[PDB]
Design a protein around this ligand. Structure first.
Ligand SMILES: C[C@H](NC(=O)[C@H](Cc1ccccc1)C(=O)NO)C(=O)NCC(=O)Nc1ccc([N+](=O)[O-])cc1
Ligand SMILES: [Ca+2]
Ligand SMILES: [Ca+2]
Ligand SMILES: [Ca+2]
Ligand SMILES: [Ca+2]
Ligand SMILES: [Zn+2]
Length: 316
């Protein structure tokens, strides 16, 4: 929309208050003009029809409960865009400042969120297994990173190239969460998952096994559900990613940790310079070793710890 840039206030899914960039043209729109070509938030009004309507508010105050997911979706997109830009120097997910569009209240009691190739979609959950998904910032950056993958490596969504796709999005979703200092961990969806249980989460990076995910290549899932287990084998890469940063002994294999700033940067490079659409786990390892060597040298500690971590997970 064409209008004046302003700032409004709303309450998020967790009852947290914040300011969000909006645009004024008779109504106050969830349109942020300060980031690239902008961030747009739409109202899917419980239908499956996308994007649906650009969000319109009459007073710039988003305190109604119906408003909560649009607030968080909008805002969390805004810090994710900022992490990318400030930390890897990328403008938007395409590297050119493309507009970020998000739709909230999609379907009725939809337990999930996704990147559809051109926009992000968030359901509201059944209110028991999940609460509105835009409420978890790691969910929101996990989603945006899928945009980012699509425009860089383009990892096909199935088998090992698809589990690497899903681990990237969980690795930067977790880096974005530490980036904002929003109570970070090495867990996925913990903030939006099972409102009645405490301490649980969708997946764990620190211990994928907690919830049953392989934490070793020899545990790899070979059937068919979930596109050859995209969201299952992703744990092998999350564990590896977890060891490089923090360090540790997995299966008798010790890893000295190099920290997360360096984990983010060896990964963003592997992802943008060496990954292809068909890359497998053995290729991800070459690629990460090659980026680590690119940045820290052949004989670095960093180079050594990525080796150790893929060795500990059984990758190659
Ligand atoms: C529930 C699972 N969805 C995801 O992991 C997600 C979504 C998600 C939701 C909440 C928190 C974190 C992540 C996903 O990969 N979206 O791209 C899923 O898609 N499982 C496939 C089997 O089931
Ligand atoms: Ca209002
Ligand atoms: Ca957290
Ligand atoms: Ca988390
Ligand atoms: Ca819970
Ligand atoms: Zn995903």
């Amino acid at each position: 929309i064409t209008g004046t840039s302003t700032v409004g206030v709303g309450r998020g899914v967790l009852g947290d208050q914040k300011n969000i960039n909006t645009t004024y043209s008779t109504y106050y729109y969830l349109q942020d003009n300060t980031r690239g070509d902008g961030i747009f938030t739409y109202d899917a009004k419980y239908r499956t029809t996308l994007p649906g309507s650009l969000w319109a508010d009459a007073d710039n105050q988003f305190f109604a409960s119906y408003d909560a997911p649009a607030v968080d979706a909008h805002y969390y997109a805004g810090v994710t865009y900022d992490y990318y830009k400030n930390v890897h120097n990328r403008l938007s997910y395409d590297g050119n400042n493309a507009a970020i569009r998000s739709s909230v209240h999609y379907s009725q009691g939809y337990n999930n969120a996704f990147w559809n190739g051109s926009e992000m979609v968030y359901g509201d959950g059944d209110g028991q297994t999940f609460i509105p998904l835009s409420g978890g910032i790691d969910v929101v950056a996990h989603e945006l990173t899928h945009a980012v993958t699509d425009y860089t490596a383009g990892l096909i969504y199935q088998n090992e190239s698809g589990a690497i796709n899903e681990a990237i999005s969980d690795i930067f979703g977790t880096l974005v969460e530490f980036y904002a200092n929003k109570n970070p961990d090495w867990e996925i969806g913990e903030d939006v998952y099972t409102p009645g249980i405490s301490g649980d989460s969708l997946r764990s990076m620190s211990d994928p096994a907690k919830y049953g995910d392989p934490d070793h290549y020899s545990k790899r899932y070979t059937g068919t559900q979930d596109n050859g287990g995209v969201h299952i084998n992703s744990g092998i890469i999350n564990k590896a990613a977890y060891l490089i940063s923090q360090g540790g002994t997995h299966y008798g294999v010790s890893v000295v940790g190099i920290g997360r700033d360096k984990l983010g940067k060896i990964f963003y490079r592997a992802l943008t310079q060496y990954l292809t659409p068909t890359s497998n786990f053995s290729q991800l390892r070459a690629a990460a070793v090659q980026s680590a060597t690119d940045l820290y040298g052949s004989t670095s500690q960093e180079v050594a710890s990525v080796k150790q971590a893929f060795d500990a997970v059984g990758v190659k």
